[PDB]
Amino acid sequence: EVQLKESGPGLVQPSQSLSITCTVSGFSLTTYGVHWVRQSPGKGLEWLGVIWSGGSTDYNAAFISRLSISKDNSKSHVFFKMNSLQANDTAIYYCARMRITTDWFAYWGQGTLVTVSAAKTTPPSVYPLAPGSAAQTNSMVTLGCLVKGYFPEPVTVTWNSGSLSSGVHTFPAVLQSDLYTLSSSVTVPSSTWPSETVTCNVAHPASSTKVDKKIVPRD
């Protein structure tokens, strides 16, 4: 009912520009300012700038040299453009009405995850993680899948087609080189495995990859 809908790329090449459109419904751009904010693990939340009802703007001076905010009152669009992105501009970007006085239109857009990278689309390797031959047994048994060298995010991982929903930790991806890696662990009865099959199902839609990998015990 009040909505700020964001549209634009989730991937930007180093040195290229990021454009986002914020489509506003539920209040008038000719009465209320719209702000732009980003969130990154390096800097947390950072306010980038604002376009006021009259079209005047304020920018964070650390960005002023490469940032532009404009709008189209008739279409109810606010436009964000930042130039010359570098790896550390990887962040979630938001349009938002904040810093309110009289009104109750304080709402944020759903957020646009922007990754700055020259990486090419690349499917994962899926390596099974089984205990070493030596030794090593006690209840329960923890197994895993290593999902290595993919781009872009995301991948999904389920176990035995989702039967082993419980006892699973699938960890956040980290960057090594210019590609992503993560792992998923699963813990299941020592009596069950290997009498009972355990297979991880990995999906990477961006490469139309679907892989099941059975966890064989090693000898």
Add this chain to the structure above:
Amino acid sequence: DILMNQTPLSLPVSLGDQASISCRSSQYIVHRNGNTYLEWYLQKPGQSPKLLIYKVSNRFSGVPDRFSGSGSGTDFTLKISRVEAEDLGVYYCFQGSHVPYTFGGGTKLELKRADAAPTVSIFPPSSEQLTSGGASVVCFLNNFYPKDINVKWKIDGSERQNGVLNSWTDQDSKDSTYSMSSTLTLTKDEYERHNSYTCEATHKTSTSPIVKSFNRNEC
């Protein structure tokens, strides 16, 4: 710029506890127009921040009575009187009085539980990965409390710092614990120059580290 310092960084609590979050500004934050634009946001995982408190003390649309703000000058506080499950997340303070607008570092509101040691599991590289030229040794440190934890890799007696990447989960919905992976990545060639591989976890629960390991001689 105006500096916004939140404390604590992290706050554990039981469902029904009262909580108090602090935000301190490096200067006075009264806008030229006379208003004090101190705002409080709560963010859940994978959601946009949502406004709780505006102009210091005013509750936003649909914010429960149990939430309240106060403060003046350089000192502001948010207090919750009876924390419910829906209140858990990361709290942020914001000043929109002086360009550039700025956020605090965040305060995480997480659910309290009894201590638990990490369940540590070490996994040698799969034969598949070795064929591909790489060797990732994976260690999982699963289901531990509190969050703080230290992981250390040793190869043939020597601490190994380079090639180690770590990834952490958020607090588990079902049991309220955390889980971590530590992954040591080597080339195949360097993996096969060494025999003993050790993952060592040091945690509040034990004065002795938890040590899992394997030997390649046995692989």
